[PDB]
Symmetry: C2
Subunit: 228 residues, 2 copies
């Protein structure tokens, strides 16, 4: 049985995800005489995608794909908030046995595209400077997410049949930051008169805005023009 | 004086940023007979970029640009961890007075590109389904960031000279989630034997891994193939 389990480290404020594919991976590979190397990355993408799927805070579908000039020019996996997966790979050449991710995909990128059920599509890209899909994905989050995140992907065979699983670790956003409060602050600052903001000293705008709240201000930083 | 002030709402775990440009904006506009409408979006991008700049957790430069088919096919602003800004705009046609963002930029996108000082470049894209740059940017974060985020951008003139300012609100990541602890958990799960993960029931992998920690597991979710 393919299932995704969500778990929380109560004392450390770190959410976790554990998942396994076999049933789903089987259905995605049957009737595609994919060589072994291709079947392996698809296993990894299926795990990666399924885990990323469970982090959505809204309803829509996410797809994680690899693109490159190597023999496997395309490998993609798509899932939705309901954990329904599907995908394909495109082999355009000679695929050597025991081929590593970096050779199957030549020079390319990982492309995360998040298209919601009502809204406009988002797409993130990062090159494949990695020996591991999980390493590349972690690189992606390091550049696009404040919350530290870790990924673990395992691939192998069980009963001659291919199987894969993985886990994800990610820091939680502060508890104290209840939407109710955040929305209040956000509604509070939107009352900032543009003339008010552009003429008064910073410390004044601050208290004129948040005199009711407990606020800590740190040292200012000079913003300047980068002239040649 | 152009400065970026960082502040924290102690009780609510919400970091804030307040910034103003005038000196820097002046230097970026002089010797470019940009019409007014173009000067306005550049003001917004300069505020937006400077704020985003201050969220970097590593050293490198970020650039926020608009691209489209309208009269202003390109508008970009680039900054680094040290808050050094620079940018340009490309006008390729008739730019109507009192032109709104949606007309200056025809049909295009917002393109955030984060290239660090050692590492590989990242790039995020989202279409301009917005009447406001801040609305589009917020849309971007909603799809790429777990931490709720809000942006406020104000543009106007002070002493006949152009000026702009803005503020950003963003939930903080849990305090409890000290890197030391997170790294421990991350090192803990990486000891998961692939055969262990792919053959044992979930609840067993969990305790066989985190029996020392206080963990809460929620209802599992079925992961399946999306057949037509």
């Amino acid at each position: 049985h393919d299932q995704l389990h969500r778990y929380l480290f109560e004392n450390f404020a770190v959410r976790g995800e554990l998942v396994t594919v076999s049933e789903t991976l089987q259905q995605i590979l049957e009737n595609h005489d994919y060589p072994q190397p291709v079947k392996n990355v698809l296993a990894e993408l299926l795990v990666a995608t399924s885990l990323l799927t469970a982090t959505l805070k809204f309803d829509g579908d996410i797809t994680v794909q690899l693109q490159g000039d190597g023999p496997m020019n395309l490998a993609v996996i798509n899932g939705n908030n309901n954990q329904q997966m599907r995908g394909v790979a495109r082999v355009q050449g000679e695929i050597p046995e025991n081929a590593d991710l970096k050779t199957l995909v030549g020079n390319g990128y990982v492309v995360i595209t998040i298209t919601p059920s009502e809204g406009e599509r988002y797409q993130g890209v990062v090159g494949l400077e990695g020996d591991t899909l999980a390493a590349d994905l972690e690189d992606y989050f390091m550049r696009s997410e404040q919350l530290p995140t870790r990924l673990f992907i395992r691939t192998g065979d069980v009963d001659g049949k291919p199987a894969a699983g993985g886990m994800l670790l990610q820091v939680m956003p502060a508890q104290n930051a209840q939407q109710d409060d955040f929305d209040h602050l956000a509604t509070l600052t939107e009352t900032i008169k543009t003339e008010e903001l552009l003429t008064l000293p910073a410390n004044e705008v601050l208290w004129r805005l948040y005199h009711e709240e407990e606020v800590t201000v740190y040292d200012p930083q000079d913003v300047e023009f980068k002239c040649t």
